Amino acid sequence: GLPSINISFKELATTVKERSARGIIAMVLKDAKALGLNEIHEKEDIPVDLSAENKEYINLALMGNVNTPNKLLVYVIEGEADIQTALDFLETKEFNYLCMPKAVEADKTAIKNWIIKLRDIDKVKVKAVLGKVVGNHEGIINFTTEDVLVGEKKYSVDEFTSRVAGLIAGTPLSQSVTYTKLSDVVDIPKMTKVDAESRVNKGELILIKEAGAIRIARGVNSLTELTAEKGEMFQKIKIVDTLDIIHSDIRKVIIDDYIGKVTNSYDNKCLLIVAIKSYLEELEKSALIESDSTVEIDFEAQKSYLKSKGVDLSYMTLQEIKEANTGSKVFLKAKIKVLDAMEDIDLSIEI
Amino acid sequence: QKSYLKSKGVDLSYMTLQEIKEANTGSKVFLKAKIKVLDAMEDIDLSIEI
Amino acid sequence: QKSYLKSKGVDLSYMTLQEIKEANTGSKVFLKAKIKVLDAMEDIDLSIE
Amino acid sequence: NKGELILIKEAGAIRIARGVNSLTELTAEKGEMFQKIKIVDTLDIIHSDI
Amino acid sequence: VGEKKYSVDEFTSRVAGLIAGTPLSQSVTYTKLSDVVDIPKMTKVDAESRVNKGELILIKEAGAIRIARGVNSLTELTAEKGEMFQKIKIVDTLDIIHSDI
Known part of the structure; x- marks a missing residue:
C-alpha cells in the first residue's frame, strides 16, 4: 500500500436529535378528480383537481393563529369507501389532526372507534376533530357550533372544525387556545352565557363574543365523562397534548435504541434510567412541563416477576431484589x- | 465424584470429604456446569405519574 | 488514533488518553482543524425608527 | 435562481447579478456558502497550499 | 534519464548512490528525480500493486518523477515480521545498531 495522504473537507452542521413530528395535518375529502393524496407541503398550492370547497378547506387549514402548520396532507378519493381508504392512509402515515368535511354520523362514529382503538391498543396518540359527536373519549374533538358566519359567509360546521384544527396545529404548546380571538369570523348566533358555561361543562367547544370579539370559549376536550382519577387536567387538550408528545417520543426512541440491539443488565438498566432522566431534563428545559421528579425501577413489578418465576422472595437483600435479573422483561417507575x-x-385590592 | 468413587469402589465412609474429592480419577474427568x-x-x- | 489502535488491536483501556497521542502512529498522521x-x-x- | 450567470443593466451600467457557482444542486454539506465561487476559490487555494 | 535510455542496473546503481547519500533522518519515499526526463506511462493501481509486491518503482508525482516507496524487496512478511520490517529505512538503523554493538 503506497502512502497517500488525504485531508478531509466537509461541513460541520450542528446535529440535533429530531423528535416525533408534530403539527402535521391529515386532511381528507372526497373528490372525483385526481384520486390520491395531495401532500400539499408548499404554501398556497391548490391543484386543479380540488374543488372550490376543497380550496376553501385548504385555505382555512393553511392559516394559523401563531404560525402556519408545519405540514399539510390532503387526500383525494371518490365519495365511495371514504372511511376505508382514510383508515388505510392514516395507518400508512402518522398525523396529528384529522377532519372529514362530509363524514356522516356513522362515518364519524367509525372514525372515533378507529382512533380510540389505535390510542388504546396501537398506542398511536393522535387527535381528530368532529362537528357533532357525543363520544366519551378525549382524543376526538367535538365542536358543536352551527350557523357560523366567517368573512360575511355561511360556513358548515365541518368547515370551521377544519379551520380550528389548522389554527390549533398552528398553535404552539406554550399558548392555550382559550380566549383566542377570531378576526375572520364576522358574526355568530346570539346565545346566553349560561348556556355557554353549560356547554363548557359538557366539554363541547363553542365560539363566544368576548371583549367585542368572537373568541374560543374553552380548550376542553370532547371527553364528556371524566372518572374520579381522570382529573381536570385530562379535560384539557393542551395538557394531554404534551403527554401524547412525550409518549410518542419515548416510543420512538425505544424503538430506535432499546429493541434487539441492546442487552439486559443492571448496568444497562441504569443506563436506560440515565437516558430517560436526560429526556425528562430536555422536557423541563422546554418548560412545557415542570417535571421536578425522577425515574426508578418498578420494585413491585420486579417482585411480581420474581414470584411468577417461582423464586422465594425471602432471604436476599432488597438491593439484590432491585438488581435481580428480569430476563427479557424490564420494569421501571417514574x-x-x-x-x-x-x-x-x-x-x-386593599384601600 | 461420588459416582466415580463408586465406580472405583472406594468407600464413602472413613475418608475425608476432601480425600474423597481428591481421590484418583483415572482417565475419566467429571465437571459440574x-x-x-x-x-x-x-x-x-x-x-410515569402525575 | 483510536481507530488506528483498534486496527492494531491494542486495548484502549488502562492508559491515559494522552498516551494515545504519545503512541506511535505507524508512519501516519491524524489531524483535525x-x-x-x-x-x-x-x-x-x-x-429604521 | 437557476444557478446561472447573466448580465443585467443596473446602476447606469451593465453588470452581473450574482456570483454563485454553476452548481444548481448544493447538497446539505455544501449549502449556501458553497453556492458561491468566492468561497470554493479560497478553499481550493488553502487546500493546494497545504 | 537526461534524454537517454538507461539499463535497469544503471538506475539501480544511481538509486543506490542516492540512498548512500540519503541520511537516516530522511526517507527515500516521494523523492524527486530531476535528472530523469521520462518514464513509461502506467496506471496508479499497478503502482500500488507493485508497492504491495515490495518492488520499488518510479512515479510521476506533482509534475515530477519520484520514488513511489522505500519498501524492501522482501515480498513475504510473516505475522511477527511487522510492517516496519518492510521499510529499508527502519531496518537500516537496526543493522547499524547491530554492527556497532
Missing part, C-alpha cells in the same frame, strides 16, 4: 409534574 |  |  396555562386570575 | 445466561432487552414496563 | 471562511453581503436590508 412520576412527572405537568405545567399548565393561565386561565383564571384573581386579585384583591 | 452451571452458569448465568444474559438476555437482551425486548420489552420495557414503566409507569 | 477548524475553519470559517468569511461570507458577506451583496446588497443590504436594515431597519
Whole structure:
C-alpha cells in the first residue's frame, strides 16, 4: 500500500436529535378528480383537481393563529369507501389532526372507534376533530357550533372544525387556545352565557363574543365523562397534548435504541434510567412541563416477576431484589409534574 | 465424584470429604456446569405519574 | 488514533488518553482543524425608527 | 435562481447579478456558502497550499 | 534519464548512490528525480500493486518523477515480521545498531 495522504473537507452542521413530528395535518375529502393524496407541503398550492370547497378547506387549514402548520396532507378519493381508504392512509402515515368535511354520523362514529382503538391498543396518540359527536373519549374533538358566519359567509360546521384544527396545529404548546380571538369570523348566533358555561361543562367547544370579539370559549376536550382519577387536567387538550408528545417520543426512541440491539443488565438498566432522566431534563428545559421528579425501577413489578418465576422472595437483600435479573422483561417507575396555562386570575385590592 | 468413587469402589465412609474429592480419577474427568445466561432487552414496563 | 489502535488491536483501556497521542502512529498522521471562511453581503436590508 | 450567470443593466451600467457557482444542486454539506465561487476559490487555494 | 535510455542496473546503481547519500533522518519515499526526463506511462493501481509486491518503482508525482516507496524487496512478511520490517529505512538503523554493538 503506497502512502497517500488525504485531508478531509466537509461541513460541520450542528446535529440535533429530531423528535416525533408534530403539527402535521391529515386532511381528507372526497373528490372525483385526481384520486390520491395531495401532500400539499408548499404554501398556497391548490391543484386543479380540488374543488372550490376543497380550496376553501385548504385555505382555512393553511392559516394559523401563531404560525402556519408545519405540514399539510390532503387526500383525494371518490365519495365511495371514504372511511376505508382514510383508515388505510392514516395507518400508512402518522398525523396529528384529522377532519372529514362530509363524514356522516356513522362515518364519524367509525372514525372515533378507529382512533380510540389505535390510542388504546396501537398506542398511536393522535387527535381528530368532529362537528357533532357525543363520544366519551378525549382524543376526538367535538365542536358543536352551527350557523357560523366567517368573512360575511355561511360556513358548515365541518368547515370551521377544519379551520380550528389548522389554527390549533398552528398553535404552539406554550399558548392555550382559550380566549383566542377570531378576526375572520364576522358574526355568530346570539346565545346566553349560561348556556355557554353549560356547554363548557359538557366539554363541547363553542365560539363566544368576548371583549367585542368572537373568541374560543374553552380548550376542553370532547371527553364528556371524566372518572374520579381522570382529573381536570385530562379535560384539557393542551395538557394531554404534551403527554401524547412525550409518549410518542419515548416510543420512538425505544424503538430506535432499546429493541434487539441492546442487552439486559443492571448496568444497562441504569443506563436506560440515565437516558430517560436526560429526556425528562430536555422536557423541563422546554418548560412545557415542570417535571421536578425522577425515574426508578418498578420494585413491585420486579417482585411480581420474581414470584411468577417461582423464586422465594425471602432471604436476599432488597438491593439484590432491585438488581435481580428480569430476563427479557424490564420494569421501571417514574412520576412527572405537568405545567399548565393561565386561565383564571384573581386579585384583591386593599384601600 | 461420588459416582466415580463408586465406580472405583472406594468407600464413602472413613475418608475425608476432601480425600474423597481428591481421590484418583483415572482417565475419566467429571465437571459440574452451571452458569448465568444474559438476555437482551425486548420489552420495557414503566409507569410515569402525575 | 483510536481507530488506528483498534486496527492494531491494542486495548484502549488502562492508559491515559494522552498516551494515545504519545503512541506511535505507524508512519501516519491524524489531524483535525477548524475553519470559517468569511461570507458577506451583496446588497443590504436594515431597519429604521 | 437557476444557478446561472447573466448580465443585467443596473446602476447606469451593465453588470452581473450574482456570483454563485454553476452548481444548481448544493447538497446539505455544501449549502449556501458553497453556492458561491468566492468561497470554493479560497478553499481550493488553502487546500493546494497545504 | 537526461534524454537517454538507461539499463535497469544503471538506475539501480544511481538509486543506490542516492540512498548512500540519503541520511537516516530522511526517507527515500516521494523523492524527486530531476535528472530523469521520462518514464513509461502506467496506471496508479499497478503502482500500488507493485508497492504491495515490495518492488520499488518510479512515479510521476506533482509534475515530477519520484520514488513511489522505500519498501524492501522482501515480498513475504510473516505475522511477527511487522510492517516496519518492510521499510529499508527502519531496518537500516537496526543493522547499524547491530554492527556497532
